[PDB]
Amino acid sequence: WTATSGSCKGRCFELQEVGPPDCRCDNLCKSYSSCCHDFDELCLKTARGWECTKDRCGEVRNEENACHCSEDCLSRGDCCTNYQVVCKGESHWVDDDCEEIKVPECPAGFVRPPLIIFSVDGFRASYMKKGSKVMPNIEKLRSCGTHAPYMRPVYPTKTFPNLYTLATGLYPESHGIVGNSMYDPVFDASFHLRGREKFNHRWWGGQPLWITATKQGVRAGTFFWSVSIPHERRILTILQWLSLPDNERPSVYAFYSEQPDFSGHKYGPFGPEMTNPLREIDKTVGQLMDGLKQLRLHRCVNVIFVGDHGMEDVTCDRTEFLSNYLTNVDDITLVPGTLGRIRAKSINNSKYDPKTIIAALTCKKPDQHFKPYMKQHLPKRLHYANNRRIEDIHLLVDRRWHVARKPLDVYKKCFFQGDHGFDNKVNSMQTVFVGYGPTFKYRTKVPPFENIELYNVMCDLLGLKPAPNNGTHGSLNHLLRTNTFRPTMPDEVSRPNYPGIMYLQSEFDLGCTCDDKVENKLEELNKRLHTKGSTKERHLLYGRPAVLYRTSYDILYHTDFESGYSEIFLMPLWTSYTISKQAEVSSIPEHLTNCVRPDVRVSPGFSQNCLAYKNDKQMSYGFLFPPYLSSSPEAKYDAFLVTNMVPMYPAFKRVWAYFQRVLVKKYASERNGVNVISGPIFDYNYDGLRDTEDEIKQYVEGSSIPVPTHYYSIITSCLDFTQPADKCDGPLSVSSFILPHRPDNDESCNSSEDESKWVEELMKMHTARVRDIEHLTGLDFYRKTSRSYSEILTLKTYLHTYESEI
Numbered sequence: 142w143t144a145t146s147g148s149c150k151g152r153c154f155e156l157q158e159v160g161p162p163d164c165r166c167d168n169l170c171k172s173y174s175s176c177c178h179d180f181d182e183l184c185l186k187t188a189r190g191w192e193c194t195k196d197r198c199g200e201v202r203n204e205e206n207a208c209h210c211s212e213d214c215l216s217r218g219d220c221c222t223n224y225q226v227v228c229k230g231e232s233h234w235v236d237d238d239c240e241e242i243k244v245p246e247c248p249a250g251f252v253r254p255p256l257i258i259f260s261v262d263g264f265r266a267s268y269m270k271k272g273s274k275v276m277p278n279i280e281k282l283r284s285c286g287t288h289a290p291y292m293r294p295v296y297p298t299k300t301f302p303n304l305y306t307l308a309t310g311l312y313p314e315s316h317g318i319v320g321n322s323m324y325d326p327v328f329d330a331s332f333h334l335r336g337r338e339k340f341n342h343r344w345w346g347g348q349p350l351w352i353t354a355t356k357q358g359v360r361a362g363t364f365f366w367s368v369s370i371p372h373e374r375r376i377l378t379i380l381q382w383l384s385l386p387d388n389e390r391p392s393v394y395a396f397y398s399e400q401p402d403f404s405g406h407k408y409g410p411f412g413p414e415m416t417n418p419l420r421e422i423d424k425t426v427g428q429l430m431d432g433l434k435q436l437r438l439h440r441c442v443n444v445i446f447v448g449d450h451g452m453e454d455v456t457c458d459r460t461e462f463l464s465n466y467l468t469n470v471d472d473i474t475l476v477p478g479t480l481g482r483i484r485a486k487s488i489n490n491s492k493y494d495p496k497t498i499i500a501a502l503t504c505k506k507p508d509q510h511f512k513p514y515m516k517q518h519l520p521k522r523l524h525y526a527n528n529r530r531i532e533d534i535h536l537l538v539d540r541r542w543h544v545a546r547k548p549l550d551v552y553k554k555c556f557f558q559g560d561h562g563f564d565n566k567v568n569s570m571q572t573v574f575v576g577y578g579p580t581f582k583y584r585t586k587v588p589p590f591e592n593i594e595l596y597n598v599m600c601d602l603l604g605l606k607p608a609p610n611n612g613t614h615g616s617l618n619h620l621l622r623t624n625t626f627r628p629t630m631p632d633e634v635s636r637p638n639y640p641g642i643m644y645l646q647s648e649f650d651l652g653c654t655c656d657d658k659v660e661n662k663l664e665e666l667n668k669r670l671h672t673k674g675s676t677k678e679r680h681l682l683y684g685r686p687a688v689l690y691r692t693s694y695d696i697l698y699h700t701d702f703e704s705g706y707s708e709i710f711l712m713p714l715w716t717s718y719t720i721s722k723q724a725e726v727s728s729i730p731e732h733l734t735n736c737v738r739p740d741v742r743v744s745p746g747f748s749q750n751c752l753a754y755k756n757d758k759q760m761s762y763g764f765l766f767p768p769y770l771s772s773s774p775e776a777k778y779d780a781f782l783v784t785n786m787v788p789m790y791p792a793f794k795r796v797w798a799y800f801q802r803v804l805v806k807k808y809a810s811e812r813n814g815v816n817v818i819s820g821p822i823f824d825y826n827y828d829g830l831r832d833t834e835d836e837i838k839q840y841v842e843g844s845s846i847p848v849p850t851h852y853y854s855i856i857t858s859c860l861d862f863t864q865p866a867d868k869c870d871g872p873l874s875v876s877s878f879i880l881p882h883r884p885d886n887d888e889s890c891n892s893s894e895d896e897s898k899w900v901e902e903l904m905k906m907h908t909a910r911v912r913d914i915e916h917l918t919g920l921d922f923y924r925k926t927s928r929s930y931s932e933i934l935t936l937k938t939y940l941h942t943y944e945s946e947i
């Protein structure tokens with residue numbers, strides 16, 4: 142109940158929310174049907190429109206007007222934004238040359254440059270180039286400020302998950318807004334676009350920027366605007382708030398535009414109808430910047446122009462129906478559209494079975510436009526599993542397509558020509574970032590970056606300590622003129638042992654064999670040097686990774702590779718090696734096909750054993766440093782050490798072998814040498830974080846050898862490819878992956894074909910940031926480079942997407 146009989150007189154767009162049944166006058170009161178009776182009359186004035194005209198110049202104040210053109214308007218803070226232009230012979234902000242803003246030029250009594258976040262829904266990255274003719278204000282922010290070619294959204298590329306990730310710096314699995322639609326089984330409650338449940342605070346996890354600011358004594362304008370409040374009124378409200386007394390005035394503000402998303406859904410991302418919405422957004426930006434200029438704030442405020450996601454061409458005729466695959470289609474509930482999430486319609490149905498649903502959806506039609514996954518098998522770069530609101534069964538839908546349960550849902554629920562939600566690496570889903578103001582750099586282009594990073598930067602802009610989040614703080618320091626955040630590298634927690642030769646061959650009873658009893662002070666001295674680390678500078682180029690948790694491990698040196706060998710997990714945490722452009726690929730000699738050799742530096746008790754692999758009819762093994770890339774026949778023996786062995790399903794070995802035999806040499810040829818670091822990952826609870834020993838769900842049969850859920854590789858070279866990877870003077874280039882360690886290749890529909898037809902496509906789908914591997918392994922890479930730490934943080938957040946040009 143709201144007793145709407147109170148009044149909004151002197152309360153219009155009040156910042157504190159008043160408690161029911163007292164009536165509200167804040168920017169969301171309409172959405173609660175809670176506004177006071179006179180809210181429209183007093184707070185949503187429209188008389189005479191939004192622009193001063195020559196005849197209004199110097200008018201007597203009429204309080205009924207939407208905005209004012211009287212002499213007193215500037216000190217009242219309610220002039221129409223074009224007041225000084227029409228009445229005082231000023232220029233529009235857009236017509237002024239840009240001039241570097243070296244320091245904040247703020248009115249007296251501003252404690253810090255305000256931040257204004259101008260968020261645009263569905264603003265695809267290519268609109269910045271493609272719409273530039275019709276967006277001159279935005280084009281001036283972009284060219285004069287700091288801008289990225291694009292900004293990567295989070296998955297799913299839907300409205301609420303992305304706006305809330307912008308506000309919190311968290312992945313959707315962590316903030317809890319995992320879709321535009323959700324069911325939470327613990328709450329037994331549904332979050333829907335239409336309706337009231339979404340207003341309940343319990344859905345919204347983490348700590349969004351307005352709460353971070355308020356907790357730290359920084360006042361915030363309310364971010365949310367009832368849809369019916371026109372944009373001009375939203376802008377005038379923000380400008381009025383900026384004229385509040387110092388003690389009352391917020392330092393952070395947000396504007397939100399439903400465009401261009403609204404029209405993009407109707408007309409497609411590039412429909413002829415899209416020009417007008419783009420023009421109208423630009424005009425709103427112009428009103429804001431003219432308004433700031435009138436208030437002498439246009440060289441004081443930091444402005445961020447940011448989108449939540451892009452927009453793709455999607456039409457009703459491009460819909461896959463689960464009723465074409467499933468017999469039991471009425472026993473499931475689907476969250477449909479540009480992603481699918483499936484659960485049981487009824488928890489009382491004992492015959493529901495996810496395994497049979499997955500199989501019925503796997504590679505059933507030649508051109509099938511979605512792929513099913515249990516959520517723990519989705520690409521780790523999506524970070525889309527660790528939340529009870531994410532259904533166990535997920536469908537990744539091809540760009541341009543929809544999935545639905547039955548045809549009746551599509552023609553009884555064609556209109557739309559655009560949609561979004563797809564994989565956040567898809568070019569059409571990318572969005573925009575521009576930063577303009579005293580704290581941003583001048584005329585600076587920065588590489589693309591992910592929207593999870595921005596919360597930290599907004600905290601930096603406001604002098605706030607960010608709440609714990611998924612950004613890597615410092616990775617965006619290069620956007621900023623000042624207020625950079627200068628972190629220290631994390632401290633290594635475990636120091637390694639450096640074992641020498643400590644065990645005799647006969648102490649090992651591992652069930653391993655190797656034809657290696659085949660035989661010189663010239664070259665016996667040489668093998669000893671290699672085992673003590675004499676080639677380490679060639680193979681460990683960026684220092685050894687630091688172990689950031691408590692464990693027992695050994696550094697093992699070899700001619701061709703160095704490794705950090707875990708006594709707890711019985712295999713390397715990492716193996717590092719460099720392959721030059723000139724390196725040669727050889728085969729595993731016949732006599733060595735089944736060779737596994739005890740490592741006399743590592744106890745039998747801390748070794749794997751061959752007998753366990755023999756007994757495990759499902760599990761085989763592979764090697765982290767590949768014997769194919771051995772530098773010489775003698776060095777090849779090192780590659781068959783039991784300490785270089787890792788458990789691998791035969792299906793996975795197909796992938797791994799092709800990577801090691803073919804692709805590493807291919808990258809070294811293309812990149813002028815590469816340094817590779819490979820290793821296992823254990824994430825049985827799909828939380829994106831390294832498992833402890835007691836979380837491992839699978840072991841090689843009859844042993845304590847844990848089975849990895851994934852295998853990673855980090856492939857680094859010189860950004861200037863005229864220099865070889867091992868003699869690089871400047872910036873680095875990296876690509877990485879986190880391949881799922883699966884007992885079948887059901888994910889790859891063409892896997893019956895030669896690996897040259899499917900493996901590389903699999904690897905691209907499972908592309909990763911170094912930072913993703915760090916989370917998953919508790920390792921910290923690039924400890925010893927000649928590069929600044931911020932530059933290295935940026936390198937660690939880099940994702941190689943394999944998408945053509947934006």
Ligand SMILES: *[C@@H]1O[C@H](CO)[C@@H](O[C@@H]2O[C@H](CO)[C@@H](O[C@@H]3O[C@H](CO[C@H]4O[C@H](CO)[C@@H](O)[C@H](O[C@H]5O[C@H](CO)[C@@H](O)[C@H](O)[C@@H]5O[C@H]5O[C@H](CO)[C@@H](O)[C@H](O)[C@@H]5O)[C@@H]4O)[C@@H](O)[C@H](O[C@H]4O[C@H](CO)[C@@H](O)[C@H](O)[C@@H]4O[C@H]4O[C@H](CO)[C@@H](O)[C@H](O)[C@@H]4O)[C@@H]3O)[C@H](O)[C@H]2NC(C)=O)[C@H](O)[C@H]1NC(C)=O
Pocket residue numbers: 311312314315316317343344345346347524527528529609610611828829830916
């Ligand atoms: C991305 O960044 C984020 C933020 O840094 C990272 O997420 C953090 O990860 C931490 C480690 O997993 C985790 O720390 C835990 O906190 C528990 C207390 O949590 C509450 O309080 C905080 C602080 O205010 C709050 O943020 C939390 O909010 C979560 O939960 C509510 C729902 O209840 C949501 O509204 C909100 O969205 C958020 O949900 C997300 O995280 C939870 C996990 O907390 C997931 O379950 C959800 O799916 C969703 O992802 C909470 O309100 C604390 O209880 C934990 O401690 C237990 O476990 C450790 C492990 O040994 C141990 O030390 C403790 O003893 C304790 O164990 C006991 O309880 C166990 C569980 O019941 C039990 O099994 C044992 O037997 C023991 O009895 C833990 O320290 C932190 O909460 C989240 N924070 C957020 C915001 O998500 C994230 O990892 C980053 N991602 C990547 C890939 O790097």
Ligand SMILES: COc1cc(C(=O)N2C[C@@H]3[C@H](C2)[C@H]2CN(C(=O)c4ccc5[nH]nnc5c4)C[C@@H]32)cc2ccccc12
Pocket residue numbers: 260262300301304305308321334364365366367395396397402
């Ligand atoms: C400016 O910051 C914010 C503004 C806001 C905020 O005011 N809103 C108003 C609108 C939009 C953002 C939400 C989504 N929606 C829709 O009808 C909608 C829109 C586009 C769609 N495309 N496809 N399906 C769609 C469904 C209703 C809400 C909400 C926020 C929520 C969290 C964090 C920040 C927010």
Ligand SMILES: COc1cc(C(=O)N2C[C@@H]3[C@H](C2)[C@H]2CN(C(=O)c4ccc5[nH]nnc5c4)C[C@@H]32)cc2ccccc12
Pocket residue numbers: 172305339340341342345346347348349365366367368369
């Ligand atoms: C977004 O994050 C939070 C939001 C809140 C919080 O005040 N909430 C949660 C809901 C609503 C009020 C905001 C607005 N929005 C809407 O859907 C919306 C926006 C404009 C509209 N016009 N017409 N209909 C509309 C619907 C989504 C957000 C409280 C929180 C409390 C703690 C942590 C986070 C919170």
Ligand SMILES: [Ca+2]
Pocket residue numbers: 262263299300402
């Ligand atoms: Ca949207």
Ligand SMILES: [Ca+2]
Pocket residue numbers: 753754755756757758759760761
């Ligand atoms: Ca076996």
Ligand SMILES: [Ca+2]
Pocket residue numbers: 823824825826827828829830831832
């Ligand atoms: Ca884990």
Ligand SMILES: [Cl-]
Pocket residue numbers: 297299319320321322476
């Ligand atoms: Cl959704």
Ligand code: NA
Pocket residue numbers: 654655656657658
């Ligand atoms: Na032997």
Ligand code: NA
Pocket residue numbers: 886887888889890891892893
């Ligand atoms: Na297959």
Ligand SMILES: [Zn+2]
Pocket residue numbers: 263300402403406561
């Ligand atoms: Zn949309």
